[model samples]
Target chain A: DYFQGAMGSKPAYSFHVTADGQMQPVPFPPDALIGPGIPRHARQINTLNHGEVVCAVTISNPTRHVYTGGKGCVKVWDISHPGNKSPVSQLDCLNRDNYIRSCKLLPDGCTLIVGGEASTLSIWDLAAPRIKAELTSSAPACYALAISPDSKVCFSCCSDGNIAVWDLHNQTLVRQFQGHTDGASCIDISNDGTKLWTGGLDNTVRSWDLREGRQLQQHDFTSQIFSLGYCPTGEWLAVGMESSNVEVLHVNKPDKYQLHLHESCVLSLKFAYCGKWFVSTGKDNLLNAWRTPYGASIFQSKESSSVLSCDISVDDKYIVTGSGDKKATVYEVIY
Target chain B: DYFQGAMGSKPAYSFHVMQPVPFPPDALIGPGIPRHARQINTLNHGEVVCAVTISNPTRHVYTGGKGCVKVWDISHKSPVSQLDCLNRDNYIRSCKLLPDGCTLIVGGEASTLSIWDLAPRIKAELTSSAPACYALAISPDSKVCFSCCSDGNIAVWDLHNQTLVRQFQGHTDGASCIDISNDGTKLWTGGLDNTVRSWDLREGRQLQQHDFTSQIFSLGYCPTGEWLAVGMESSNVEVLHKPDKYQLHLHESCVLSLKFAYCGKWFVSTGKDNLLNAWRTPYGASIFQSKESSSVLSCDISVDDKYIVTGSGDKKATVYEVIY
Candidate 1:
């Protein structure tokens, strides 16, 4: 709990914790670091073998479907069925040989935006399962995407480190925000939609105020930032690094909580809708769930291969992760 | 001379930073938070530092560590003097300088609070129930001293007489921190019981009780009045609302200490997370930030807000030159 004495700062203070009971002071924090609200467990629910390394994933708010992104296409599956084979639909995107790095499903569930190793982003219509519009940019590749809460615009993190602000309604590039010196790797927008946050291969995390259309803050790190998630509730921003450590930073303060759980580079991070807990996947093949602000372990799971991307259901009822083993797994959040 | 925590360090080693990020020289004029802080000296006290206070006139940093409070001029690398107290083994939990910069109060893992005449020798030692004191606050007029006792009682003492006047009650657990209104009419004390109690110093009674989700570890009342900044075990800094109770989420662990700079425009909070954060008063706007080599156990700002001194778990104190 990091809590100190009735003896406050009793130097390496100890708390008598549980599990078979009555053991001498465990120097490390007790399981969960549990204090306020926390859940009991998270159990596995389904798996989709995409046949190629899966790099991106997302879930529908209805809790009925999941999108697993792999080489050249995004496979849409119906999670409600127990005996389904393959995907319900496949929207081939970018180039067949180029991998899909990121994909975003609009809140309405009617449109899907896919980007990768090509200069073109394909927006697909779910009904006809056809390409609705194609977005072309000077940058040859895209790494991540964030959709404003209103779902009218999409912010795309590009290989050149510039953010392409697209008017989804007109399928045109509306503006470009630049600052990152290297490829921008991840992105998340504030709940109010007045600001945006992004991580880059250049070893910095930056924030942009949408109202002013200017950079507001830049946080430097010793390692490249692979992924990040701004808490939906505000204040905390969790950044996953290539160094394998996930540090949660305060939006306005230098205060940071460094978490060590993965043995290899952390690849993806996602905050739950409730913002109370978050999960990060890693090349170490570990999926770690932690309590917000302070990273008390909520749960940990290991997969057969490196988990590259992750997403929590809108209502936080489920979690989906894409892995290097060419499969996507889903978990039902057990209350 | 920026420093960071040891290896656990490796790439995990972090630099002390007050500005968000170092920008190219050409961009210094660009929009950014106002103040910039740079580390100027390190005081190697050689023991876990738990308490710290800055003497206004002397510009000396007094850090309470194991068994004593060492005094550093900060112009030199080593301490100019050390005021050894208690058992020379028990840790000192809190220290404060009377605005006159002539008297100092030291308290900690022992029941005795020592009032030192920094101008020369020992003055008096006031003994209590011996449970231990977590923090101490001196009155604005310097006529009184208040100790946050380990027994959950605020011990009030009249400094001139060296006598216990009256005890302020209400905390069910050890009082972890304390702060006084500029006028000295009101007192704010936080405790390990997950609550903060406001006391009427003039009347000697508990005025208000505010409960929280986490233990109240540290707090500061804005000198400008109408606001209070509280540091908690949950790693959140809540600016108590006379208006918008701004919730600041920054420290990633238990907050250990907090102090409002005399300017009242900003305040700093230190944490077990190894970082010290300076925020704008009423609402927390990040004004400055610095990472240390170990958990920063305590911190203090010089009266003029020209220097910041921090006591660390690494058994040392650091002095930073504040550049606006």
Candidate 2:
């Protein structure tokens, strides 16, 4: 079980669950295990990844597959077998030695849309034994890809400061929304598939109306937004930026909650399945799980892995994280 | 492989290794014959009276099994297994729950270490049983699992895909309990030769090795990430100041179990004297002491941190609720 002490000098200890379920006490033997007072060994296990530098990670619903985009390839992990050493499958999407910039699993479950160097958006038919198809866009280098919930369309943002729209069912380009004066690096789509929000080096969040294919609103910030996540319920949009503050934008209201967190830039932001909370990871090597509305940090874990990205399961029981330390961490969230 | 990166005006990324040696009780089923499922055994192991966790949230001890590595259900009285690591009929010398709790690492006089994965049944399915893995620990993120073998070298296993990752060649004498920093960046190992070695996780380089003058039995890490408490056979517990890079000894008998309270302000050590003592983190000052009749083999602070539980040579685990 996990326990935490009170804040003050006279700390009151409270016990919480540390395992998947409840915890119980165990007995001890009369004789000690090791020798009188000498230690025995120092063994260790290697985590996932080879050289850490992950740009994005996401988990598939029901199946609990961890999709991670590392330096040069996108790998899929089956966490069902916790002690296993190999990923269930790996799709090499990037050119040899070329680092993957960003990736997102299409809501349809059959398509994994990836964007990276050379201004291309690769659409992989995930059902096939291998990546069955690929698509090339007209940007210098597509850095981020976001698919609308309806699975009818996709939004691709690139380093050349343009947002391209693709017709997924038709496998053709429909329109390009141009507004940002600089490269766009991150993108998020609303649940209803009406609004598209993109964050870029320009230090602004531009909102567009997909139906009109035009920019409708823009929110400026002092820092670049590296990660943007729309709440599953569409109540809020959490933006993790270079400023280390996670801006909680209320979808239906003008109010926004600015969360001052981490000593360094916030790299990734994800909302829990219940939509009552969200979690963020930063360059400080800290993953903070926070409650929504008030933005209270419920708990935080210091990962030895450099946390580049994180994704919560649909049930919120588990958290999958990709780190630059060449490892992906899956944390069991008690409560 | 964990990466650390910082972005202010620009993003700067670097790769580092978090090698922490290291959780949990539930009605866990045993390993199944099927590829990756667990098997549910009908036999009952024993009772759990106390548990102590090392690192931020890995490495655990259920004071039962006569020092054997047994799994506990957080709220249950019975154990999941009496012996996680036992070849033929060998008794366990020491058992440690790695940081992630996925691997149960055991060591004994059989002169070998064995590793057992409680979940996904990694070792259970191997054509050959897990080669003797003595002391074991998994990094906090549940990736790399490490084991100290009788051969005197630390064997590292990759947990994500199940493979032998690397071996850190060190310690001519048998090593005992090992502790990893919170970030899994550094490792501190104690051995029978009265020496403690610190190794950098990234390149498997030996950072520093210290001679205790007394055999160090158990060790613990403070939350502040600075001091490490090494339980010694010299009837004393030595507080190794990481920043000061020195050791200060306290206690009066072979200190067996050493642990830092949750707040990290103080630590408690138990020993052959059958006494438990709490010490100040900054200075080796005795804060409190409790007496037990039998030799205190192991001691643990409750999850709540309000009480300290001790496992003794008397075959009884006692709980002491802290009044102060």
Candidate 3:
């Protein structure tokens, strides 16, 4: 039923780098969403009802297990069995009424870190599925989380405008990057883990160098910067805004691209492993997939309620989204 | 293709189109006029200038275009400063200075409104849920700013705290232009939905909606009283007052922008046809007319009404000395 009204009448927008290197409108590329490596569409494969506003989601690397975050807990579902109505397990992290904002899984799939409406983040060892360590900070809540590719460190965007860098091996708070004047809402890391980008309610998107431990650049917007993803292959970063715009910026140049589709605040965004495409969820109750660097509308789906959070699989074969309607919807990529 | 279905086509607006109301060859001339507008200066903005505003003290002219806004001293050739705003290449649709002229608000093809401290530097940005802002109006008390959104909601923002205060929603399509009264009690907004709506600022309720056959592109509320002038894609600039609405027919193309002089005696309308028409209030009287080499996309008058400035499609802004 997702495809009954899924196609957006509004044309997908994108920018082309001009001969002089200026970012200019592609106008109508015609082939914008029609390339060889891109997917043609997606099919809804399953729905996992987390029973509360599902605010965060992550899929296992081999793509069988799914983690859904909602009020106070992270529910684990084994999607390999499609008709199952129950979760394999549930981890109660924060106080019963507080919502979990982010959940992350290590590359080895042996560890899980969850943070949300609490000052403490819980790290779980998956073999026994029990809390192994707790990382605490002064911030009242953590808005987002990112695990390094090597799975050695975890970065958390906090409510008090600090990016709390955690050392996983020793389970200590190693560093805190302080620059945003308001809540740091979302974050993403470079594939090599050398660079990081964080969006804030302060209306700025900032870049930090993990090696140097210093802020490298700050991009100001007329709207609060909401969610962002750095292209894993390098050179570009995509930002979602409270203004319902998805803007892609060059890592070093003045070149930038503006993509419009979502009709409300863009809630979350994630780039695929290939770095050639990305997806964004919005309060408009829509999920949009776009071409990377310059956004070309690749696919769109209108959900029953606000699509709050989203994640692409490591192999890019699946996409999972959490929604305000209290469920996580899984889609299989159809090329 | 006339009246075709297409979205996101470069300012390629709504689907409504109707026959233009035709009038005879000439319109009457009225005493309310700038006898002549002498083209005084041409500012090389280096890009298509989309928005312009002059300071109340007549000291600076701010020109908005791709990526940034350039502030120019009235007496100098070089820019006082260039403020980078919006995404790198998005056009700034509107910029307004608070009555004090120490602050500027810029909104445009992007989602956020840039609140710049003209007193010194960049200050803050007010974020909202609209994809693009079409126009902006500052309240007379300078406490609130109203933004017309492409999504059809009139976003009312509290300027002091940089937060969205409320929203006045009624338009069925993109809210294209806006203006507030001198007393700041009433607000007027034009929309691509082919209607003009007035709102009560104190009550925060829509008071009226006047339907038209063409999409509204711009509008201005006469500061002194009841007159409201609306520009449209139909190439008509109509001065609305009651049963005596005057259908102005000078613009040969879409009326892209319009504004009222502080005196409330005359108003100006710019067009994609490369003309700027000045008119007397309440009547379809031609006050004065000037033609630019390219489309005059936006316009503004100085507080003293001694100068007129316009942003054009030809990568520059033009200034004129208003002669009595």
Candidate 4:
């Protein structure tokens, strides 16, 4: 039994009253488990201030420019100059009060797709430093986004529970995947670009086939899904939840592993390029790294505020996190 | 029988189990305690602000960051002046405004503390043998300045001559924090060696030492009484009442800096938890708490207790209007 003690007896349950006057389950034995395959350590090399709550972050592949999404704008910083406190450029996208939820850089590193509280997705041209196109949807807002490996299309998870696909060349709606009954909170595309995975507040993780435009599988959970990532080199899917747990589920297998390092809602998740480990950020002000498959604890870093979103560089040399503290911290990943 | 449910079952027991013992009833409750302090303005320094000081009569706030100290006229949203003191490669660890509100003392990773006069500039530079100065405090009469050094000694300097007057040595590790008594007769310091020391200024000797289980990062001596609030690396702020102390558990990370309000009825503490917590003087009851977007590194209250200013890791200093 997962609750069994070392002496073979069932452990007792403990609860703590939160600031909001709700009873929260306290891990009786403290459920943290550190396993092998974890990274040695991560050092924060630089901090880029957005001066607002950073809800999303992304890094360009070969260019190594970090993009952080804040209220109504995306700020780009070059990590090559560690001491530069100012962003190289600020791209204004949505209204002044609205937050930018997701930002994704295309494979070519020239195009950027920004989605947030507004129903329209702003596609930015890096070379021109201006808005190239706007893809509007019937949904009230966009919560997450993903781009195809071929850079031909983009997928946006909308507040109305539908996933909207846009063709980049023509800036038109390609198709819609409708299954989630609540807000689709996160999305990720497979490395080969054939499969798309979306997690929703409806407590379901859905996988869709891009070519067939049909739902392939649905996995139900007890808690709402907030963020997710699919391992590039394996069939493992790391799903972060509102219940402060990270579960690793195989694509087709029923067996799964649960991680309990975070104390609050998991806000963001990303896998390293090597696929040996993945990182998850939470409202607990913690950034946790886990080994795949068995869900072993690798390494963890706690920022000064809640980590809202995180992105691993394409080469897996660095991890950048956007936090509630109005700053984005860049960490160097040690092998 | 309680473990027979599914993996996602709600907790079954009603009592405390393996976690740390429940706080005592007399222990301070965090919520709804302090008067709500509203954020009125934010001064963007574009760097991680490690220190803050408020000039009483001038009503000016000084925020210390990389290489320079930016002075803000709290009446407005923008900065009034920038004092370039330390080298660009180093961060200013501490900045203090004297009682006269004319001279400012700045210290940091550099071995020398630069004294700057508002009009004239560069009054004197006091050199210390310590590799870095972690914190600084000025005497109430404004005659002397005390610098906490990395070499585990409190370097006392005469403000007029810019020379080291004496060294109070006892801490085995770096001295991280310091505060002078209102009368300038007593000084309290906290150190990385996990000790809180009190020095008798007249005798120029260490008077008392209190050992703690964790490194002490910040401390404030109550202006109205004989109480000391100590912020520790273990995420606890203990208000020491001589032989007894009350442990405050609101912060989940290291408490970086603290300051007492001029009235002495309350004080504020900033932490790596990204929170600014205001607590009652002796009882340690949290009056109110405000969460910033990043770790709060330094804090200072206005002389009139009308405003509170905090320097954070987020590269900005937030100004909060203190409500009674």
Candidate 5:
């Protein structure tokens, strides 16, 4: 049955479940104990309150470091030995007033990339104790940054409908590949290092041949494309979109395979090492593996949080992911 | 100098070089044809292409039947002959369309690779029909043929003389797959004994043998010939590079198929667990994975490298269109 509730201005406060598991309204400031890390608004400079939702979380590659971006500054946690049940290292972002929108690790597993309000990009090299790079653009905010396999180029997609490309070697700006008319959410490079693919709120997957320096093709969907990835050989491009569907584009031929998978919006997609498979995570809290030939489900992992970011190891044996619930989960592919 | 030429534009055609795309523009028709015997009227509508290719100028498709070898005209997609193996009672374990496509060599459960000619007419001319060939590969120059047999021996055949040149014995069990390096001097074989043995074809000596914990179903040398990918029944596809090695645990069941794309950037592996894995060839990084309803037993990369063809236990063969 459809949800039947009176549409009105409802106050935000703590709610409780009775002995029978019935929900009831409760007061704010539900607990008095102070936490170790103070959370702040993603855009505002205020202390975080209990039950404040998390927007994004990232775990470092190679190292089991966990970082949460919410309220304001980014709070880092060292989960080197995750079984200890607590973070081993914490780094507070200097963004005292603005909220941290997202964070990521460079491909080298040494630099931390952080994006936040006011369209600012911050790069922190783990080897050094300070920010290594600061990139600014006209965009309102940056949602994601994808570093190329060669580590020579870095791309950041923003809410202003543009992707910022940076030359890592020279530490200079590279020409922006502009095709999306709406905000771009995620971007990925092909495994063969020939193509750059991007997904946007405009519900389109745009392919660009890096050698050509222009857009080669575009596939539009009914929903926003949240994430995109190229197979290891650059043969297939997997797109995760808003309508709970993953679309795969065959480059040479005009063939495409679409799967209606998650009940909720799909947020991320990455192919396994062998290039014949890919994994998708969505708002439905489900991680799915699909074989390349037929796009059938091989396995699925269940999670309690809405997964936001995910990455597989080089060996294609394990997967690490971060969720909206302030937890990073690591899974090993048994098969 | 920077590339100042027009990009993505169809260039003027020439004889020496062409675009990277496949030559027969049509999916079902072209100069490079696969020899499939039965037409639409045949009862075996779901028969595997098994092997469709052009070795020399001739097209051939080795189908799963009583040692059947068919020749074809690629442009016409018509079968030229239905050559029955000399050992009619045996199953065609493997087949190779020589570089010229005119000479087709087939192996059966009897441990011999039978050679056939299609240019003049479809006829089974005995080559080295011994040892029950399980897998085979032809040298790029078309002079030498390497065939692995069920008896754990690989025989080198002299194509010109039509004789068994030499045989190297190493594997303790059946050799399931074989691949020759581009230079044709080195040969690699994977066997049921869970080992990949490399042989110096010239010296007829086993150069090196790598051991695995499970049965090796298939293997291939990277285009650079610097690394080897071994697909195993343990659901692990291992990349053996010179300095480092890594195992990819993507497939849930026995890996039955393996192939490296022509570019050597990625490789695909299929398993009995009904999963297909694509990994970065040199690094063994997983790029993507897929699954079918039934087990995948054999797979091959298209000549143009645009599509991957796989034969499965599901009694059906599928062609996956590659995008990258």
Candidate 6:
């Protein structure tokens, strides 16, 4: 039993017959149907320059504008105009040297929430282009953010290992889920906004019943978790880790799959709206697309620098990646 | 004022720029261009692979690294054998296969070039006063070999007699790249002193010189045309065709190696940016691109133009099938 989970150090298995006239080590078969539904390649359509390392990116729903977060500022680019080299607007937030870690836009695409190395989250009104409110917390920094479907609430994963829930209407802290021993690194909400999933540096993935406001389940792993995404249309949860593995877990069953394609730490993961495939970025400068729950590689692209963050558009038409090379690259997802 | 000669600690530049060009174009235009080349296999050699050469018959790929040259059988995905040519710490700088595919000349940090014939043995050794050799080229007839030396000279040798034939000596700094014409009458060489010179092989004299604004690292002359592609330390591959030239803006870092396909339709370049780029001839339209895990130090193409192999700093060489 002790050697069962040691898949990370094992060499890729090749088949051989044993003395008993049977294959000694069978290849681990994927449980899900892996096929041609996965995305094969992406053509780079635009590259938005932030003049520094971009740590986060978010696209507005039904809008062509993209928000790229860097040191203390978020630059907006209208990707529809390919020839525009300058940002349409630059929203300055936090201190000059502090990095903004995560940014999310509401469903209406008017309100924006930004978090980073500060103990607070800035809620900005994009129409007015000003900070509408500030949600403070005891944590040193906020690493990730997730908003509900109705845009009435926002959930933030904090460095203090707490998930802070805020009422966007009143600009007040509503509740906090506490269990993780280390920093909560990532979070994702279900399509109906009924459940929330959070991954922490303490090597645990926890699910929360958002309506009941209580912890529902917990799964443990041997590697520190860095990013995760809950499928919008399926019972699958994809978790990225510091060990360069992407593990997909079933929401109701114990059967899971591990992906070992990334050569370095897995930094970010995002599932397309269709829920059939997902993309993961890594410190190895690779963007790998895989079939859901099966862990079969569909395609891969290598950037010139570490891919720090990634996000897929609502219609699954595009993918925007923030890289250590101080630029955000936009890719048109090919079917 | 046309040449911005060596700025401070930077290498010398011999060209003037009219405007600043922004990199990573939103989209490149090409009809029927393949977007990506598929990686067929990877050969791990356990050391940083600095030089690579494909045989004329396309059976084996020879990758030279720290101390040895490993021959990989491309017919299948495995190494055929290893040839020990240098000390453990000495890096192999360049390797080339003769036209007949029987002889291989390898040069490195060692002050001697090893000519290997595969009764599997070293046939001859040629010595020079230069501390290291940077690049190697062979004549089309397989009768002569030219080596770019660290002491700013191109050493030409007669392979039949294994003797020094002559030397081309105009580069002010180390000569780093060399290429021969298909007819074996013209030779092109690039040097670290920011200059590329064309040599008349028949007359043994310098024919022309073009100055650049950055250190020249590698170059390849199209076998069918007057076009010359020069790779530089400035992360640009400039295709020079007499009066008109196209400065290709890709590769985020220094361009390390370049090679022309046998058909003269396209060429490939490897860079420290970890990218392998294929571009159309003359117009410089991008055809296909692939990225590896580490800095790509060297590259070579098969004679049929169906395959490309790149030696990278990650201690492995990757083989890709060229798709039209």
Candidate 5 wrongly placed segments (more than 4 Å): A1-335, B1-62, B69-89, B120-122, B127-131
When just chain B is superposed on the true chain B, each candidate scores a TM-score of 0.88, 0.68, 0.89, 0.88, 0.75, 0.88
What TM-score quantifies how close candidate 4 is to the native fold? 0.47
lDDT of each: 0.79, 0.61, 0.83, 0.80, 0.61, 0.80
Interface RMSD of 4: 17.7
Fnat of candidate 2, please?
Answer: 0.00
What fraction of the true interface contacts does model 5 reproduce? Answer: 0.00
CAPRI grade of model 3:
incorrect
lDDT (10s digit) by residue, model 2, range B1-324: 111111011011111121111101100101110001111111122322222332224223344333454554443145444554344455454545655456555555454444566662335321112334345566877667666555556767675565676777677766666778866698888777787788888888677987667777788878667777777888755555634432334456788877777667677788888777665563443344566766777666654455555666665565554543
* Per-residue lDDT over B65-154 for candidate 3, one digit per residue giving the tens place of the 0 to 100 score: 998899998865768888896467888899999888889999998888989897666799887889999999887778888999999999
Q: Tens digit of lDDT per residue, candidate 4, span A1-335?
A: 11111101112222333335364333322122221333445778889989999999998788458999999999999888877889999999999999999999888788889999998999999885899999988899999998888788889999989999899899889899999999999999876778999999999999999999999999988999999999998688889999998877777775566667788999999998878778999999999876655554556687999999999988778899999999999998653
Per-residue accuracy of model 6 over B1-324 as CA lDDT, tens digit each: 010000011111112132222211211222223334668889998889999999878889999999889999888666798889647887898989887777889999889999999658888999998888999988877788899998889999999999998999988988999998766788899999999898998788899988789999999988777777889999988777747576776688999999998777678899999998877675554555677899999999888887899999999999987644
- The clash tally of candidate 3 reads 1
**Model 4 segments more than 4 A misplaced:** A1-38, B1-324
Q: What's the alpha carbon RMSD for model 3?
A: 23.2
Model 2 scores a TM of 0.46
User: What's chain A's TM-score in each predicted model?
Assistant: 0.89, 0.82, 0.93, 0.88, 0.75, 0.89
lDDT of 2 at B268: 78
| Candidate with best lDDT | 3
lDDT of 2 by residue, A1-335 (tens): 12211111111111122224442211111111111211111111224563547777777766557777876688887766667677788878877566677777766577777777765666777774366566677677887777777777777887878998888777688898898878887888776768888888889988889878888888888988888877767778888888887777776566666666577888887777666667789998888765554454445668775688877767777777778787777776553
Pairs that collide in candidate 1 are A5-A8, B47-B315
Q: Per-residue lDDT for A164-275 in model 1, tens only? A: 9999889889899999999999999987779899999999999999978899999999999999999989999999999988888877875567777788999999998888
Q: Is the docking of candidate 5 incorrect, acceptable, medium or high quality?
A: incorrect
- Deviation (Å) of A92 in candidate 6: 0.9
**Predicted candidate 3 versus true structure: per-residue lDDT over A1-335, tens digit per residue:** 12111112233245555436475555434334445556657778899999999999999978899999999999999999978899999999999999999999988998899999999999999984999999988999999999887888999999999999999999888999999999999999876678989999999999999988999999889999889998989988999999998888888887788887788999999998888788999999999888776676777778999999999999889999999999999999765
**Pairing residues by index, what is the TM-score of model 3?**
0.50
